[PDB]
């Protein structure tokens, strides 16, 4: 599973497309995936599993005019291809016609594909996987006498190849890697027991934060929570840690995606051209970053991806749409069939410490809990944990509180975005200072 | 994919074991899985996907003395077996010795295997699949003017075959089938949007509750929630709806499983032989039920499964253990490598309506939220929703409250178990009336 195999997979995709044709299909879309890697788990100094995985499959979506049919299988080979295609068509021929259905026009298929350098094999023997996973836990325990237990420490290293093709003649494919190391620790103190973790993800294993650093960090976090208590119900400013900030903007994205929009299940429906954020705030996508964890050179329709803004000086200038979204809404695709890639929120020059100082007083949120977000109405209420701030400092840990606001207002009330930017996924935000929110606790 | 295909999978298992031997592993364990079915989704009267799946794979766990390794693939053939076994061994040979590691003794492999009749293909064209999924959503909307939106209604019908083997020479395998229809609805009222759902599951497609009945129910449930409000903080009795009662006993199971126990991460850690429940309460396992959703004739070590109690007259008479658990704890296996199969909590003759009455005043819980359960200590706190009861009737819907207690005390405080028994999974409980809990709002 490397670039070296990509050619076999192209050939496989060609055969699937050809078979669909032989069987009478109007058009079709095919995806093939190979993946393999090694996954190591440790706990309380014990190795629990060390496992090697190799997974292959393909899925096809077919058309019989305006009728649609899908099928997938992990089998390979001629009979399999014949069997899977025949199934997609049994469905296509017995389901109904969709006006919006069918591939993008052929002129729209990516003409060329940048090299995104996503493939960095990690030479990692299971002996070194176990060595590191254990060095991580041990650094946790070694960091504070009060960290007395662990949930898993998991080290994951994987390689994959994906190829996509359609009846329009498009065929595109890339190989990638992803390595991660997560650590989950339990600490006891002040009449209580508290839990936290840390992790890192990188396409190049070598760029992962040291196993030690990840462990120390999961431990400090666990320990800092000891002695958490509620606070007095009050409307105060709230500071979201970068990794919780990410989820917020996730709700933004969901709300501006075609699916939500045309299902009339989005608070942001119709918001194109509106000020949803502060004048200084921009949100923009950069799909071609070399080595990035969210890079992609084409979307799930096979349109070329391109750099673009979604929010510009506070203003929503674009929804996130694929071909079928666009047709549903009477708009063009934004070459985002399958979502965004490498999203960025613009930020100032202040770090979390600076932002805490600026907040003066309020709630720093480092964890949220529950399903309290309604995308249809923007209504938001979630359990939360973190630290209370006063006189520009962290006074003490907080738990058993809930936070409330409408997202619509929340986004308007963003006071700053920090330069303490998260790098472990597809959405780079720093910490987010919100002017005020309803904090409730008893 | 059914019984006709088993012998091919046996043969495949044999080959893998042989190939393990060829590469010099001391012993091994192999599992092969084939699965296929149809999955239909509908939403607001639209069809969103109709898809046919077919998935095959195998996994092997190898030993090199007291050293252990595992690998899996979904590929097939002489080269896939060679490459996958080679990999499990590369790991075995480069990881450390575990004194407790290795298979169960050969004497213990299941000598025979009852016919559990878990295989009931559903002749369901995608045309019919879609007809039904839609008829379910339509019944929901038709049930109450206030049910204005939907999340998915999903219909799944699948078939599988599993075969497992040992280097001890044990080989065993069964075909099964599993069909479900779930419906998720949204109501609007009273300043509110409320979400709820209903579903059914059965190995026989025809035994599923009608698509209409499932829809009506998801809608009634969504609608009943409109106007939910908090209640005043108080210590009071709490009645768990059967489907939430399942999750409770799940914490109990987790707590008496080998892993929790030897990791010293269980509040029930020395509990064998103690009263944890009312004298009248018993919990027992019945793995051989014909056609049940949880039936199994052998565990993940290949020991024969058998009917047995875990709680007898309120007393914990058994943990849930596999061979590796047993060794860790210095105890025999309870033929429960991979968990329990078809568990039952004993109950009285009262239904949910009867238990509401008996409770007189308190909180009926029909949903929980938040990962608020500490199995290490038993501490429990969770977001909850349902209805308030007074004068033995449901007064109004409740939301934005939490419930708290230690499970240790909670289980001691069980007043009764309803006969409204839950059938859609591995755990058959009725509604659970708890004497008192801390309700906060």
PDB file of C-alpha atoms in Angstrom, chain B residues 116 118 178 203 253 282-297 305-310 336 338-346 421-429:
ATOM      1  CA  UNK B 116     -29.768 -22.130  17.482  1.00  0.00           C
ATOM      2  CA  UNK B 118     -30.545 -17.783  13.961  1.00  0.00           C
ATOM      3  CA  UNK B 178     -30.722  -9.498  11.655  1.00  0.00           C
ATOM      4  CA  UNK B 203     -33.748 -12.116  13.444  1.00  0.00           C
ATOM      5  CA  UNK B 253     -21.971  -6.249  33.638  1.00  0.00           C
ATOM      6  CA  UNK B 282     -31.958 -12.738  40.116  1.00  0.00           C
ATOM      7  CA  UNK B 283     -29.908 -12.236  36.980  1.00  0.00           C
ATOM      8  CA  UNK B 284     -29.156 -15.154  34.661  1.00  0.00           C
ATOM      9  CA  UNK B 285     -27.857 -15.961  31.211  1.00  0.00           C
ATOM     10  CA  UNK B 286     -29.484 -18.238  28.590  1.00  0.00           C
ATOM     11  CA  UNK B 287     -27.227 -18.631  25.563  1.00  0.00           C
ATOM     12  CA  UNK B 288     -29.089 -21.346  23.761  1.00  0.00           C
ATOM     13  CA  UNK B 289     -32.395 -19.632  23.173  1.00  0.00           C
ATOM     14  CA  UNK B 290     -33.587 -20.564  19.713  1.00  0.00           C
ATOM     15  CA  UNK B 291     -33.790 -17.471  17.492  1.00  0.00           C
ATOM     16  CA  UNK B 292     -32.803 -14.901  20.078  1.00  0.00           C
ATOM     17  CA  UNK B 293     -30.727 -11.912  19.194  1.00  0.00           C
ATOM     18  CA  UNK B 294     -27.906 -12.801  21.666  1.00  0.00           C
ATOM     19  CA  UNK B 295     -27.694 -16.611  21.451  1.00  0.00           C
ATOM     20  CA  UNK B 296     -24.240 -18.270  21.051  1.00  0.00           C
ATOM     21  CA  UNK B 297     -23.119 -21.918  21.398  1.00  0.00           C
ATOM     22  CA  UNK B 305     -21.550 -21.691  26.543  1.00  0.00           C
ATOM     23  CA  UNK B 306     -24.023 -22.676  29.273  1.00  0.00           C
ATOM     24  CA  UNK B 307     -27.055 -21.304  31.136  1.00  0.00           C
ATOM     25  CA  UNK B 308     -25.992 -19.901  34.511  1.00  0.00           C
ATOM     26  CA  UNK B 309     -26.786 -17.221  37.118  1.00  0.00           C
ATOM     27  CA  UNK B 310     -24.695 -14.189  37.974  1.00  0.00           C
ATOM     28  CA  UNK B 336     -17.945 -15.820  28.857  1.00  0.00           C
ATOM     29  CA  UNK B 338     -16.767 -12.172  24.571  1.00  0.00           C
ATOM     30  CA  UNK B 339     -19.465 -11.403  27.197  1.00  0.00           C
ATOM     31  CA  UNK B 340     -22.877 -12.753  28.124  1.00  0.00           C
ATOM     32  CA  UNK B 341     -25.606 -14.016  25.839  1.00  0.00           C
ATOM     33  CA  UNK B 342     -29.333 -13.470  26.417  1.00  0.00           C
ATOM     34  CA  UNK B 343     -29.279 -12.003  29.940  1.00  0.00           C
ATOM     35  CA  UNK B 344     -32.429 -11.720  32.031  1.00  0.00           C
ATOM     36  CA  UNK B 345     -33.304  -9.758  35.136  1.00  0.00           C
ATOM     37  CA  UNK B 346     -36.151 -11.331  37.137  1.00  0.00           C
ATOM     38  CA  UNK B 421     -39.700  -6.502  29.310  1.00  0.00           C
ATOM     39  CA  UNK B 422     -37.380  -5.193  26.665  1.00  0.00           C
ATOM     40  CA  UNK B 423     -36.787  -7.491  23.653  1.00  0.00           C
ATOM     41  CA  UNK B 424     -34.576  -5.689  21.196  1.00  0.00           C
ATOM     42  CA  UNK B 425     -31.150  -6.703  22.390  1.00  0.00           C
ATOM     43  CA  UNK B 426     -29.051  -8.863  24.669  1.00  0.00           C
ATOM     44  CA  UNK B 427     -30.531  -7.767  27.992  1.00  0.00           C
ATOM     45  CA  UNK B 428     -34.074  -8.406  29.081  1.00  0.00           C
ATOM     46  CA  UNK B 429     -35.151  -6.037  31.797  1.00  0.00           C
TER      47      UNK B 429
END
